[PDB]
Amino acid sequence: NAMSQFMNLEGKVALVTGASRGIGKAIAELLAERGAKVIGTATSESGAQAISDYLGDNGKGMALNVTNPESIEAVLKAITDEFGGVDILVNNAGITRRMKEEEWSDIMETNLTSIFRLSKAVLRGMMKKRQGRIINVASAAKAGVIGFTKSMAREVASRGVTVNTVAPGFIETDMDEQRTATLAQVPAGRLGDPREIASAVAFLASPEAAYITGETLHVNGGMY
Amino acid sequence: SQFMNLEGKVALVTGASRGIGKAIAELLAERGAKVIGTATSESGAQAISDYLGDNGKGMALNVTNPESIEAVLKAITDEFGGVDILVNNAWSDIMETNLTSIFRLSKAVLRGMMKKRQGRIINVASVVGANYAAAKAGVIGFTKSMAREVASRGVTVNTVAPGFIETDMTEQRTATLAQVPAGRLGDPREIASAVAFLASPEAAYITGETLHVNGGMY
Amino acid sequence: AMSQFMNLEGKVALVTGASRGIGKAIAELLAERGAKVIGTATSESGAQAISDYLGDNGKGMALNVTNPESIEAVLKAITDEFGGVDILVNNAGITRLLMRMKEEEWSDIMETNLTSIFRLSKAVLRGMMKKRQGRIINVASVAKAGVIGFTKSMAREVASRGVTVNTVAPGFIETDMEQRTATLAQVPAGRLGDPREIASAVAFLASPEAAYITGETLHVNGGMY
Amino acid sequence: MSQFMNLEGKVALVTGASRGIGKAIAELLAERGAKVIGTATSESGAQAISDYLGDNGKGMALNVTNPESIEAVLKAITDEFGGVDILVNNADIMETNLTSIFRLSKAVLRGMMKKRQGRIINVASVVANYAAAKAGVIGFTKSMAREVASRGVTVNTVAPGFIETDMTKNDEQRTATLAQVPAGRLGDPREIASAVAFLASPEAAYITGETLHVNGGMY
User: Fold this and answer.
1) What CATH homologous superfamily does C1-225 map to?
2) Which of A54, A58, A174 is facing D52, going by the closest CB pair?
3) What CATH fold (topology level) applies to the domain D1-219?
4) How far is D1 from chain A (nearest CA, A)?
5) CA–CA min distance D188, chain A (Å)
6) What is the DSSP letter of B141?
7) In terms of Cα–Cα distance, which of B71, B70, B81, B74 is closest to B33?
8) Domain positions in chain C
9) Chain D contact present for C73, CB below 8 A
10) Interface A:D, Cβ pairs < 8 A
């Protein structure tokens, strides 16, 4: 699809981390519907294969461990070799958890440090090309995400790369009166759908969002 | 396609005769909306009809007169159906007054939006280049209050805040461009994109938001 | 009532012949599901009784389905007060030998049970198609047996503008009205239907979730065929 | 959260639930309060079903062509969750698949008919050999419905048109697909699940022997 030039991502290579279910999957599917060549990531090969299956001719799945440089490097080389340089990066990977030191580093590595590494690694080629999109999906330690987006955006704005945050509210995931209590904080009176997170990411990924950078776009039913 | 498709939507865009307003009206039309753009005069209205063709028309509106608002809404409702998308586009006395139109127009289209449990209101603050900031802050304050009040009935209310956009209004250009990290002025079409996204079925869970379209200027 | 599933909040539903039985059951459930409901009866006192059971969820109006002026005046009043009709349920009819009735009596029977469907449908379609969103549901078991043909034709013509047109075809349903034994022998399920079971079907077809169902006859008849 | 279309207390067996329509069906029955058991051919496929169902059900390995596997799957469901209330059969190659529908159906029917309450829903395939397969399923539905109607069990077919799936996802073969659909779009798996769910509900008790088409006016 993308029968028109409006919001058309044909020719774009999109790397979406954590794409096996929920928001990540919804993101990967829509970027594909819009004509992107999509590479979604999972921690395992079988998870990667399941991503390949739902992407078909519109992309594929790859195993990535966002906390390991070697894996990042090997995943980028394989993407570049087969599809061309990454144009759109969606940092969606994360795990939602007293803990031990090692367990907390692991939580920071996965949810924040990975964002830094992946972003830095795709920026090389984006900035040489003077064209790129980085979108950080962050509503635990994901609160540092907005600060990082604003700093990186200010630094790379002049070379045609945008960096934005999409911040979900309560979204219906795979996971009785705790739902009632959840819904009481949302002025709209319903949970979001993963597809609504994807829409926002897809809009920001488009050629038409070229003058939006440093922005936090909240998708939360007014929760604000 | 079904993506960002406004077919069957009735969109009232105020101040649609040139620049951002025009760019907004055109794109909502390209996306399948039935578009009514407004100007202060009948000849301005006629020029809007000319560029909209079969995809809508122009109407004279004086945003500061209740009778004109009421008569414009009745004519739209009669011919096209109830307004689904309203785009409020276009010195203290000048801020107070324009602000006041936003309230009146909004209140008037909200009746039907809330009965239908479906609506979009988008407030376009003014283009960069004290008074500027005062006006933007007035619009943003109204958006956030009205959004909270109507959110549960399926209506969204958002602000799109332009930066420095290439218009008639806007060497001092060098100095303008120095405040924009992206190193260029925006195009009116980039404002229209943002408004159109927020107008879509797909932006149903975004409300109370200020979406900045300014090249990192913030 | 409390979720986004089968939720008709913000929809305006016109249900003809809503004073009792199936019509009433349909009107009530659309209301329970959040619709703004306008039910019709032939008389004002019948209209009032519909207002009484709808309360804040809608009202009753007198409609004569065989008179264009009455249709036009009923649609204008709905549009003015509630907004454009989103869901139209054609349920009106009289159930009464063709060879012993007079010409004028039979035209009246055709006008009421078939011709009204055409006129009402055409009249609400203007706005549904401008909006690219609508539901038309024709409740008819063998109004007349011409209903299914008319549903299929109108569905094919309006499908692309986001309107669906379907028939719900009841079997033997317990109305206000041995011979019951003989009735029940033709129903594989071995019981009469409840009007509420007709309303369920109409409501499902009325919902955002039935957007890809059009041109269908949904039979609610305990296995008859 | 209301009594309308509420499947709380119902046990639903959905075959082929790992992706697309099957998965969409399993998820919605779960959202509606059903205890859902979805099946896949492999254990890893079963595990992936368990993962997305969580506390609302689980996955089990089933080989629909083997009576011992059917029997062992039903016993494990009955033991843990109670008797199967709703069965969704979600699939020459037509003869065999047809045969699985008969076996599964016959096996769950024992308890449905003792209980005088049950739902069987047969999902024909998504839009020559197509029509031969649909016709086989529809012919079985109508026969079995007539036979079990009096004991409070319904048996219906949901017949999808062109639905957006893995299978149907070139640029101009889609154009040609869409030209046969008066609605001018493909269906979503979720729209198939809606129809199945409606037919699975207490409120569809007086619908049986029906083919409900979900195809945008295609026929």
Assistant:
1) NAD(P)-binding Rossmann-like Domain (3.40.50.720)
2) A174
3) Rossmann fold (3.40.50)
4) 9
5) 13
6) H
7) B81
8) 1-225
9) no
10) 15
